[PDB]
Ligand binder design. Structure first.
Ligand SMILES: *[C@@H]1O[C@H](CO)[C@@H](O[C@@H]2O[C@H](CO)[C@@H](O)[C@H](O)[C@H]2NC(C)=O)[C@H](O)[C@H]1NC(C)=O
Lengths: 50, 36
């Protein structure tokens, strides 16, 4: 829904208040997005590199 | 911790350093300055 990024999706146990869209921790690093269809919180992990 | 940068682990683990310190301490208890 307009927020683009790259990574791997997974399930998350964090709980959102009924009005937020997506969370973050620091420095504009998205860490939790909820799909509008399911209203379930997901989680984003950067793809492995090295 | 992964945003475009990496952190490398140390070559010497903590256990090896503890073992070196124990060896030094036992040596200085028993022999003194002779083992240097
Ligand atoms: C999207 O919205 C639809 C409603 O149009 C949801 O469909 C309902 O889902 C609940 C939960 O399983 C059911 O109890 C209802 O019977 C469903 N109603 C209809 C008309 O389908 C749907 O669950 C929502 N999410 C997705 C992913 O489709």
């Amino acid at each position: 829904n307009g927020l683009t990024g790259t990574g791997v999706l997974t399930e998350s146990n964090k709980k959102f208040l009924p009005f937020q869209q997506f969370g973050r921790d620091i420095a504009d690093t998205t860490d939790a997005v909820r799909d509008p269809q399911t209203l379930e919180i997901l989680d984003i992990t950067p793809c492995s590199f090295g | 911790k992964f945003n475009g940068l990496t952190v490398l682990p140390p070559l010497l683990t903590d256990e090896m350093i503890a073992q070196y310190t124990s060896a030094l301490l036992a040596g200085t208890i028993t022999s003194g300055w002779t083992f240097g």
